[PDB]
Amino acid sequence: RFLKVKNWETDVVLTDTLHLKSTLETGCTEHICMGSIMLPSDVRTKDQLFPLAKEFLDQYYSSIKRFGSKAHMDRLEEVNKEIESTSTYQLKDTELIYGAKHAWRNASRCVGRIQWSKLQVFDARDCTTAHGMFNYICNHVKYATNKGNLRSAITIFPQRTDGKHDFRVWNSQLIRYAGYKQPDGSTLGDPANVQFTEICIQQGWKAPRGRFDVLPLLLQANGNDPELFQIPPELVLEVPIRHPKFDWFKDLGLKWYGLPAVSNMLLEIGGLEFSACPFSGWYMGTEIGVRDYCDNSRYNILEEVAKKMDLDMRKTSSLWKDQALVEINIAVLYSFQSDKVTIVDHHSATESFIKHMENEYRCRGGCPADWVWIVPPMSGSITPVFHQEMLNYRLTPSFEYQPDPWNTHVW
Amino acid sequence: RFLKVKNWETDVVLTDTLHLKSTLETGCTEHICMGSIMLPVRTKDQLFPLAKEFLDQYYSSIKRFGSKAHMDRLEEVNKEIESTSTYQLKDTELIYGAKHAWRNASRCVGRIQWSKLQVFDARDCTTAHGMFNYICNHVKYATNKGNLRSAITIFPQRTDGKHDFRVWNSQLIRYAGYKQPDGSTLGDPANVQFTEICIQQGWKAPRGRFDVLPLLLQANGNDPELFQIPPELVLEVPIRHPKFDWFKDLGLKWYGLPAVSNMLLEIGGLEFSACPFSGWYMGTEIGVRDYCDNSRYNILEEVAKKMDLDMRKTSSLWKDQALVEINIAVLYSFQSDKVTIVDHHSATESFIKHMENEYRCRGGCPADWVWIVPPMSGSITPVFHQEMLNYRLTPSFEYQPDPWNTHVWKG
Ligand code: HEM
Ligand code: HEM
Ligand SMILES: Cc1cc(N)nc2cc(-c3ccc(OCC4CC4)c(CN)c3)ccc12
Numbered sequence A: 001r002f003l004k005v006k007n008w009e010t011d012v013v014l015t016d017t018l019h020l021k022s023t024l025e026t027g028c029t030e031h032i033c034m035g036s037i038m039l040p041s042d043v044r045t046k047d048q049l050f051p052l053a054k055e056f057l058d059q060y061y062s063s064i065k066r067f068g069s070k071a072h073m074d075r076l077e078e079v080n081k082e083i084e085s086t087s088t089y090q091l092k093d094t095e096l097i098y099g100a101k102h103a104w105r106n107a108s109r110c111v112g113r114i115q116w117s118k119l120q121v122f123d124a125r126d127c128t129t130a131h132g133m134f135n136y137i138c139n140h141v142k143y144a145t146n147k148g149n150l151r152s153a154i155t156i157f158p159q160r161t162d163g164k165h166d167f168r169v170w171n172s173q174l175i176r177y178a179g180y181k182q183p184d185g186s187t188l189g190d191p192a193n194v195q196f197t198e199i200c201i202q203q204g205w206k207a208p209r210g211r212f213d214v215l216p217l218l219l220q221a222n223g224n225d226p227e228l229f230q231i232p233p234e235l236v237l238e239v240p241i242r243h244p245k246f247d248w249f250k251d252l253g254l255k256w257y258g259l260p261a262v263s264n265m266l267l268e269i270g271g272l273e274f275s276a277c278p279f280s281g282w283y284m285g286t287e288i289g290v291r292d293y294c295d296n297s298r299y300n301i302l303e304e305v306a307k308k309m310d311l312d313m314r315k316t317s318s319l320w321k322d323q324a325l326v327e328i329n330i331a332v333l334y335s336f337q338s339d340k341v342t343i344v345d346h347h348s349a350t351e352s353f354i355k356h357m358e359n360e361y362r363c364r365g366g367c368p369a370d371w372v373w374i375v376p377p378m379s380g381s382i383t384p385v386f387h388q389e390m391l392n393y394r395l396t397p398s399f400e401y402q403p404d405p406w407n408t409h410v411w
Numbered sequence B: 001r002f003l004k005v006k007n008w009e010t011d012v013v014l015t016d017t018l019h020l021k022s023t024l025e026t027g028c029t030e031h032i033c034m035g036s037i038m039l040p041v042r043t044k045d046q047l048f049p050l051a052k053e054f055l056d057q058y059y060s061s062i063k064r065f066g067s068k069a070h071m072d073r074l075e076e077v078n079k080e081i082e083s084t085s086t087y088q089l090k091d092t093e094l095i096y097g098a099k100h101a102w103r104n105a106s107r108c109v110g111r112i113q114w115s116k117l118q119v120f121d122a123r124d125c126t127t128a129h130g131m132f133n134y135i136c137n138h139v140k141y142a143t144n145k146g147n148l149r150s151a152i153t154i155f156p157q158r159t160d161g162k163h164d165f166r167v168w169n170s171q172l173i174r175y176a177g178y179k180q181p182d183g184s185t186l187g188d189p190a191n192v193q194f195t196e197i198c199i200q201q202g203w204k205a206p207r208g209r210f211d212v213l214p215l216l217l218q219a220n221g222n223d224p225e226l227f228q229i230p231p232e233l234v235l236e237v238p239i240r241h242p243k244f245d246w247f248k249d250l251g252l253k254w255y256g257l258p259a260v261s262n263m264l265l266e267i268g269g270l271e272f273s274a275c276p277f278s279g280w281y282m283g284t285e286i287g288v289r290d291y292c293d294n295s296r297y298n299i300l301e302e303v304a305k306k307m308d309l310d311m312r313k314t315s316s317l318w319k320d321q322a323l324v325e326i327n328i329a330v331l332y333s334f335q336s337d338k339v340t341i342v343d344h345h346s347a348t349e350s351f352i353k354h355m356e357n358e359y360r361c362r363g364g365c366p367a368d369w370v371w372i373v374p375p376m377s378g379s380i381t382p383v384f385h386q387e388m389l390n391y392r393l394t395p396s397f398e399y400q401p402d403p404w405n406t407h408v409w410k411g
């Protein structure tokens, strides 16, 4: 019941007690493990909301060494009253900041959580319109980008009320490149965003129909029809991709944006649901070069890079894909570092995460971790997380998946 | 009840009903996933339901369910268990059992070959010399002068747990490892503990870097005995690189035949504690794990030095670079010597084909994503984007504790 995890590279063994505080459900049973399913998983009644708040306020007041104190009981009863009356409640700013930091701390699929307590929380709960959302999101981007010295940030828009007044950022990330299907066959730009790039045009966007066109923001306030806004290009920091050894690399004409900013997730704190909460940090190199460039359903430039390297692409056993994959990821890290844009390689981030596990087992009793997502998508076994046993479980506050709004919005 | 898995690269969706026939437990619960945990004397009381389930399976597969042959076989085993507290498998049952243990091995990426298993019945064996003879013939047959063939040799099943047959080697062919007084290791660090046992048992250790270990074989619960595999039976491949002429000078070689010998074969509640099985290598087993794991031969540094890489900062990806070169060399060397080997791209593609076929004709294929995905270049292989369900089916290969930890020494 006090589970142990072993690192098989170092024989270090940590004891996990945090999992016994786990609330939600993983998707697995004693007969079937679903740990490789991408997604297991419209208002809260007054009865379910009350214990969710108590649990959250219990852990908040414990974290500041005031469990069972004046302020604790008072806040407990004050929230209790507010729920009985209004059917919901409002977080104090301190609770909001704690809640968001701990949603990140609890994100079992996130390798970058060593930074969890340094989150800059932007309270956008007074926002009322998509123009206002646009303003908050522009200020978020500017602050997070910081001329390339990237800083972690979240911007939290008004919480769900009755599911009819939802704030939503329709983009999956604040900054993404357009993808257009060609009349002949293949896809121009980013194929992962073809449907979204379509809903934009299909909503009025004038697409430059280039390869790396930054998509417009499609912002939904208080449940109304979403509105298009173009992020000021001077706010979108991009990095041209060159290789430190191969001069022809620059000629491929590739670039990527510096700010990874996920905007389609739901932030749950003390039972309250924040359907619009774009958060951002900085990239791990493999997220751009392994996945964005080399996935078959993405930019798929592997074949091209290998032809330019004069590699034998006739049999898989030459490992030409593997060789080109490494070069591409050397270039991405070289480019970002040359332009002084924050980035981390997968060796550094996974080493950081092992230290973070060390810290969480020591000062907290464990750290929920999803091995399938923590291990980087290349060179997996030469990174220290590969040989690290991890326990995955769901702690709240948390970031959760939510349906794409166009499947849901009574347009 | 049906369960669905989705390939996020092809959008292919498969339906799993086979998990309903699942007996044992996974280690997971509704509130915790143990999917990355490495490791998560039987009485008549519980034996006959396990026999009956196996025989029902066996007779279904031969389209004789409910037949008089089926019913008589059930009665026969029933009477044999009542009277002897165990039972013997017919030859046909043993062969079916061993193939299905492999077919059910959720961590095995090579299962497309499962129906082509050569089963060697060694249940008439009685002494360690007899085990040496059977194992020698296994190695000769499986090796087949480099045209490798899958095989398994099955020694007598457990009776009271006090008369076990065991192969103390983790694999039939493995290289010795010697801890030096200065803390360094000569040979394979993975085998230091077993090398020491062998030396203590009387092995004259040549103390080189690539010494094939002796067999340490235990018949009928007696003390184990040492045997030297005839070196002409041990096929080996010098490692060279097709472009780098200095690679041969590293002095690396590896053996052709992966033959795992420390696992337990479970068939109808019978336990075959000595059942060495062999196939052929996926390149990464040698070139990623055996050579580049920090706790193994760990030749990344010298390969990187001789490539004259920037080893100062990890963000140069010098480790990823040297890992690919080593894996090219392993594949090149085996193919040049006409020793069967499969690269990870071909092996993973075949597994997807196998897995789809198994869903179509069997209702499922239990599969352990954490183990199926190769330890390098993960996301550019098709299994990375493949959702999988993990569950335990019997017949099965189980882990068992090393025998030196449990053996009662006769002396
Ligand atoms: C600061 C540097 C950060 C790095 C290097 C990083 C890295 C990653 C990576 C590599 C993944 C796997 C996803 C994929 O491979 O596509 C991930 C997942 C995730 N990240 Fe982080 N991240 C960072 C910051 C943050 C921040 C600031 C937040 C929120 C405040 C966050 C929340 C999440 C969540 C919620 C997930 C997974 C969603 C889930 O659990 O289902 N990350 N991160
Ligand atoms: C013939 C070509 C084969 C290939 C290429 C292959 C490949 C692999 C690999 C890469 C693993 C993961 C282990 C590791 O990474 O160290 C594995 C696991 C395993 N393989 Fe295979 N294998 C083959 C044949 C066989 C055969 C013939 C058997 C038994 C008759 C077998 C039974 C297993 C078992 C029991 C496991 C552990 C599975 C578990 O615990 O669920 N394999 N295999
Ligand atoms: C702040 C941040 C920085 C970073 N460097 N990386 C990040 C990656 C994700 C993330 C989480 C889930 C996810 O996908 C899961 C979806 C259910 C399928 C994706 C990929 N869109 C990205 C979220 C935040 C990230």
Ligand SMILES: Cc1cc(N)nc2cc(-c3ccc(OCC4CC4)c(CN)c3)ccc12
Residues within 6 Å of the ligand: B038, B039, B258, B259, B260, B277, B278, B279, B280, B281, B282, B285, B399
């Ligand atoms: C026939 C065969 C061929 C091959 N090409 N590869 C194989 C790899 C394994 C295997 C299974 C488990 C395992 O490790 C399990 C850990 C104790 C829990 C290892 C690591 N040596 C290898 C077993 C058989 C293999």
Ligand SMILES: C[C@H](O)[C@H](O)[C@H]1CNc2nc(N)[nH]c(=O)c2N1
Residues within 6 Å of the ligand: A008, A386, A387, A388, A389, A390, B035, B036, B037, B038, B370, B371, B372, B373
């Ligand atoms: C900690 C982790 O579960 C452990 O290192 C596993 C991960 N996946 C693996 N996958 C394969 N194929 N082989 C292994 O040895 C391992 N080791």
Ligand SMILES: C[C@H](O)[C@H](O)[C@H]1CNc2nc(N)[nH]c(=O)c2N1
Residues within 6 Å of the ligand: A035, A036, A037, A038, A372, A373, A374, A375, A377, B008, B384, B385, B386, B387, B388
């Ligand atoms: C099927 C599989 O679970 C899916 O492709 C996952 C695997 N692991 C991953 N891991 C990370 N970090 N990011 C991903 O998108 C995925 N995709």
Ligand SMILES: [Zn+2]
Residues within 6 Å of the ligand: A028, A032, A033, A034, A035, B028, B032, B033, B034, B035
């Ligand atoms: Zn699980």
